[PDB]
């Protein structure tokens, strides 16, 4: 019931401009769990189905099977944003500790934290 | 060229709820390889409504950086912007100011 890091929620990213990721789509919570408890906002990364293989180091793949997704998808850690909690709709799932390790690594690469 | 730590003016709007909106300076935090090849940047909002860090993901910035008033870098307000959203390049953060940002970012995304 409380929003946790690694949770996967469905959320409306629109409206967007240019090469920003829009649409209603799954997103993964990447904000820290203390911030998840007190802030009115969470930090997410978009999950897309237009690709199913990682193109760049900030992409992390995820099976459709284990995660109740339409298609095999990739987590876009180069498409991350802060959302108000009201944006989060159904809770789809949550990432295994192994998948979140991939995410955290892609995140370090993404934001040049080495 | 768009570089990490640069500070640009950008239109964050439209936003929803407690998301930081408005035209304001933002600081690029995406890696410089992504800054070279992608059509998007990852930025953190800078606000002037406060000048002291309220939470560990806040970083204050001092005239030095060509800002209206002393401000805070909101590392809990991150977003990916199309490069077209960026307007004037106001400045770029000092190496030490960026060391702050790195550390607030680690806290922010539970990356320890």
């Amino acid at each position, epitope marked *: 019931d409380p929003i946790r890091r690694g949770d996967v929620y469905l959320a409306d990213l629109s409206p967007v401009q240019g090469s920003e990721q829009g649409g209603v789509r799954p997103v993964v919570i990447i904000q820290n769990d203390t911030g998840n408890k007190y802030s009115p906002t969470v930090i997410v990364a978009a999950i897309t189905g*237009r*690709i199913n*293989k*990682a*193109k*760049i*180091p900030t*992409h992390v793949e995820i099976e459709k099977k284990k995660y109740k997704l339409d298609k095999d998808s990739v987590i876009l850690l180069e498409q991350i944003r802060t959302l108000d909690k009201k944006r989060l709709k159904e809770k789809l799932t949550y990432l295994s500790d192994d998948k979140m390790k991939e995410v955290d690594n892609a995140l370090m690469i993404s934001l040049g934290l080495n | 060229p768009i570089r990490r730590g640069d500070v640009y003016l950008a239109d964050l709007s439209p936003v929803q709820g407690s998301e930081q909106g408005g035209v304001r300076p933002v600081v690029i935090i995406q890696n410089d*390889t*992504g800054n*070279k*090849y*992608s059509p998007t940047v990852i930025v953190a909002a800078i606000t002037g409504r406060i000048n002291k860090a309220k939470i560990p993901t806040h970083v204050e910035i001092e005239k030095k950086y060509k800002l209206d008033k002393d401000s805070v870098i909101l590392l809990e307000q991150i977003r990916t912007l199309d490069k077209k959203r960026l307007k004037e390049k106001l400045t770029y953060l000092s190496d030490d100011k960026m060391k702050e940002v790195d550390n607030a970012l680690m806290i922010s995304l539970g990356l320890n």
Partner: nanobody
Amino acid sequence: AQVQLQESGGGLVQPGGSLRLSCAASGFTFDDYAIGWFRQAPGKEREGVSCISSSTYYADSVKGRFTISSDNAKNTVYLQMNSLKSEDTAVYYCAADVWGCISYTDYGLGNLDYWGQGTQVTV
């Protein structure tokens, strides 16, 4: 998947000479995809050479001497190779990608959607 890539136009060339590669894109939407070229020497990893879509991309060592171009009618993509060098001796593969041209850069990981079989270029 739904896409045929067949590259053509290789052969032998003297240093400083020119070649034009062709890549026939059979089927698959010419417009919503990125298309470009890779090259691989013996024992080397596939290096991205150039890309185009939505915009052009060239790797550093080929800039000014190589030009990519599109003939939408013929569903082909052209790579003009001028001022060739001994180092440019390699198999050249064309490739197409749903996502965009970043797969063709040093940052991409090389996982492209569609590929051709490769044409040899020797200088």
